[PDB]
């Protein structure tokens, strides 16, 4: 197949729901921490679904029209990849009624919602696993997991298969038809609650036979439901038409940040990598790629840039220029900082005096350009290096075209007429100042 058409016009906002906004005190756990606390793997801040509803104006003001939520099902941890019941929202987030309110408000605003499908593993608190821990070989669920022997032992190393050796993340046995039934049931159930797509967590830990069945199940509900795979290496395996519509585009993240933050990759090397990536992606799937600069699994963009806001803006300029759907990680738009998980999972500040408004306004501008220019959404991409510190991202439909020139040096001029991919813009000589960008259209 090809990715859903609507992805061309999508702009995602990624939220880690424990940390976006706390609107309902009745849902706070007894162990809640102050909103300004340092995140850790164990604490709870009380972010909730009503908090999301209440701040949808912020997200629409940024230019986003879709949300990617990390897991929201009942779970013991703050990140919720350890689900204990795939059929219930976590009690600290809210009820199913509140979830439907969020969906209804999103539908009213034209915002789509993509949830995080965690099918490789559950939590050790999941009712099926607890039943195996208690009843052992007599449990009906023993073969829902891969338990080496009894008793079940977590420490010092688990005697059961897990996600990357983590004792509290037992691995689901996806070779058991009963487990596959459960998983495909979860996929269909949440679609029925109104969601618009699923992001696949570590799909490479399962197998393609299962993911083909998953696509069939999802697309059987609606061909317009989006499936995006988490993939940190090449996307190609997920874009053959039988599994995903796109991947999280971590390849492009690495290219962009190597140029704008690290210094190590120059414009020639950035263009060659972008063009090679675009060529590897099959036609019909470029639009489904979910492009990003950071996530809940990376340091924050502004930290990667060592606090250099103008340089960080270069990375946003590149992000919004690329074919595929751009995604901003919550808080990055106001210049939050932090090292990798747990450091990137700080609470979103709502006191606007802490906000970096140069970043916010800048990202808003790049979003507006893409929104206004059809070619920036539906146009094919070519990357053209001009010199070691200067790159142009050209998006061309037919007769029309647009281009974003990004410069990481101390200034340059571009003779647009001498560059064949830029010549149709009829833009003459463009002068860029230090860490400058320019956005041009026919």
Ligand X SMILES: OC[C@H]1O[C@@H]2OC[C@H]3O[C@H](O[C@H]4[C@H](O)[C@@H](O)[C@@H](OC[C@H]5O[C@H](O[C@H]1[C@H](O)[C@H]2O)[C@H](O)[C@@H](O)[C@@H]5O)O[C@@H]4CO)[C@H](O)[C@@H](O)[C@@H]3O
Binding site for Ca ion (CB under 5 A): 22, 24, 27-28, 46, 48
Count of residues touching ligand X (by CB under 6 A): 12
Tokens standing for residue 95:
């009820």
Q: Give yes or no for residue 291 binding ligand X (CB under 6 A).
A: no
Q: Which stretch binds ligand X (CB under 6 A): 54-62, 84-92, 161-169, 312-320?
A: 161-169
Q: Give yes or no for residue 154 binding ligand X (CB under 6 A).
A: no
**Identified binder of ligand X from the candidate list 9, 136, 237, 341, rule CB under 6 A:** 341
Closest CA to 102 of 52, 31, 162, 155: 52
Please, which residue, 72 or 405, has the CB nearer to Ca ion?
A: 72
Q: Which residues contact 340 (CB under 8 A, 6 or more apart)?
A: 297, 298, 299
The minimum distance between CB 77 and ligand X, in angstroms, equals 7
**Identified binder of ligand X from the candidate list 12, 13, 20, 81, rule CB under 6 A:** 81
Contact 235, 281 (CB under 8 A): yes
The minimum distance between CB 74 and Ca ion, in angstroms, equals 15
Tokens standing for residue 389:
């510190």
Binding-site residue ranges for Ca(2+): 22, 24, 28, 46, 48
Q: ω into residue 156 within 30 of 0, thus cis?
A: yes
Q: Round to whole Å and give the CA distance between 288 and 290.
A: 6
Please, which residue, 60 or 202, has the CB nearer to ligand X?
A: 202
Residues 202-221 that bind ligand X (CB under 6 A): 202
Closest CA to 249 of 278, 270, 214: 278
**Identified binder of ligand X from the candidate list 84, 112, 296, 300, rule CB under 6 A:** 296
Q: How many CB atoms lie within 10 A of CB 297?
A: 15
Q: Which residues contact 164 (CB under 8 A, 6 or more apart)?
A: none
**Identified binder of ligand X from the candidate list 38, 40, 135, 164, rule CB under 6 A:** 164
Q: Which stretch binds ligand X (CB under 6 A): 44-52, 160-168, 189-197, 399-407?
A: 160-168
By residue count, the chain amounts to: 442
Q: Give yes or no for residue 122 binding ligand X (CB under 6 A).
A: no
Q: Between 357-372 and 309-321, two packed helices, what is the crossing angle to 10 degrees?
A: 20
The minimum distance between CB 289 and Ca ion, in angstroms, equals 34
28 binds, among ligand X, Ca ion, none (CB under 5 to 8 A by kind): Ca ion
Tokens standing for residue 246:
């796109």
22 binds, among ligand X, Ca ion, none (CB under 5 to 8 A by kind): Ca ion
- Using CB positions, name the residue nearest to ligand X: 297
Q: How many CB atoms lie within 10 A of CB 56?
A: 18
The minimum distance between CB 299 and ligand X, in angstroms, equals 11
Please, which residue, 33 or 154, has the CB nearer to Ca ion?
A: 33
Contact 408, 432 (CB under 8 A): no
Q: Which stretch binds ligand X (CB under 6 A): 163-171, 188-196, 221-229, 404-412?
A: 163-171
Within 13 Å, how many C-alpha atoms sit on residue 301's CB side? 29
**Identified binder of ligand X from the candidate list 32, 154, 166, 309, rule CB under 6 A:** 166
Q: Give yes or no for residue 68 binding ligand X (CB under 6 A).
A: no
**Identified binder of ligand X from the candidate list 237, 297, 400, 421, rule CB under 6 A:** 297
Contact 83, 73 (CB under 8 A): yes
Q: Give yes or no for residue 79 binding ligand X (CB under 6 A).
A: yes
348 binds, among Ca ion, ligand X, none (CB under 5 to 8 A by kind): none
**Identified binder of ligand X from the candidate list 53, 122, 163, 405, rule CB under 6 A:** 163
Q: Round to whole Å and give the CA distance between 52 and 49.
A: 5
202 binds, among ligand X, Ca ion, none (CB under 5 to 8 A by kind): ligand X
Please, which residue, 22 or 162, has the CB nearer to Ca ion?
A: 22
Please, which residue, 164 or 418, has the CB nearer to ligand X?
A: 164
Q: Strand 197-200 relative to strand 226-229: parallel, antiparallel, unpaired?
A: parallel
Q: Give yes or no for residue 76 binding ligand X (CB under 6 A).
A: no
Closest CA to 270 of 136, 404, 150: 404
| H or E stretch at 208 | helix 208-221
Binding-site residue ranges: 22, 24, 28, 46, 48
Tokens standing for residue 352:
């606007």
- Using CB positions, name the residue nearest to Ca ion: 46
Cα torsion angle, 344, 345, 347, 352, sign: positive
Longest dimension (CA), the chain: 77
Please, which residue, 169 or 322, has the CB nearer to ligand X?
A: 169
Q: Round to whole Å and give the CA distance between 289 and 2.
A: 11
Q: Which residues contact ligand X by CB under 6 A?
A: 79, 81, 118, 163-164, 166, 201-202, 230, 296-297, 341
């Amino acid at each position: 197949v090809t990715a859903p058409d609507w992805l061309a016009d999508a702009v995602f906002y990624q939220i880690f729901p424990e940390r976006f906004a706390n609107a309902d005190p009745s849902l706070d756990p007894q162990n809640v921490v102050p909103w300004g606390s340092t995140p850790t793997p164990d604490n709870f801040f009380g972010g909730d679904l009503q908090g999301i509803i209440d701040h949808l104006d912020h997200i629409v003001a940024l230019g986003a029209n879709a949300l990617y939520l990390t897991p929201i099902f009942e779970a013991d941890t703050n990140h919720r990849y350890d689900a204990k019941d795939y059929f219930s929202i976590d009690h600290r987030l809210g009820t199913l009624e509140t979830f439907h309110a969020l969906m209804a408000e999103c539908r009213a605003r034209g915002i789509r919602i993509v949830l995080d499908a965690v099918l490789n593993h559950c939590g050790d608190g999941h009712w099926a696993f607890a039943d195996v821990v208690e009843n052992e070989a007599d449990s009906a669920y023993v073969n829902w997991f891969s338990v080496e022997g009894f008793p079940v032992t977590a420490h010092p190393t688990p005697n059961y298969r897990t996600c990357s050796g983590c004792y509290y993340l037992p691995k689901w046995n996806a070779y058991n038809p009963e487990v596959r039934h459960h998983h495909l049931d979860v996929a269909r159930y949440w679609i029925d609650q109104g969601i618009d797509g699923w992001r696949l967590n570590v799909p490479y830990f399962i197998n393609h036979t299962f993911w083909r069945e998953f696509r069939t199940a999802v697309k059987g509900k609606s061909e317009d439901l989006y499936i995006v795979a988490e993939e940190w290496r090449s996307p190609v395996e997920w874009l053959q038409g039988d599994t995903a519509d796109g991947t999280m585009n971590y390849t492009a993240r690495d290219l962009i940040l190597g140029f704008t933050a690290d210094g190590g990759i120059d414009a020639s090397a950035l263009a060659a990598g972008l063009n090679a990536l675009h060529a590897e992606i099959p036609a019909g799937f470029h639009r489904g790629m979910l492009n990003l600069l950071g996530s809940h699994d990376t340091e924050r963009v502004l930290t990667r840039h060592a606090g250099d806001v103008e340089a960080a803006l270069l990375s946003y300029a590149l992000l919004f220029s690329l074919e595929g759907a751009p995604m901003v990680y919550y808080g990055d738009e106001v210049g939050l900082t932090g090292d990798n998980d747990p450091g990137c999972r700080g609470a979103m500040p709502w006191n606007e005096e802490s906000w970096n408004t140069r970043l916010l306004d800048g990202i808003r501008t790049f979003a507006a350009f893409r929104a206004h220019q059809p070619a920036m959404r539906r146009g094919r991409q070519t990357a053209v290096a001009l010199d070691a510190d200067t790159i142009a991202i050209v998006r061309s439909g037919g007769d029309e075209r647009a281009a974003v020139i990004v410069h990481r040096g101390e200034g340059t001029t571009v003779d647009t007429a001498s560059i064949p991919e830029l010549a149709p813009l009829d833009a003459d000589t463009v002068v860029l100042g230090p860490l400058g960008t320019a956005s041009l259209a026919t």
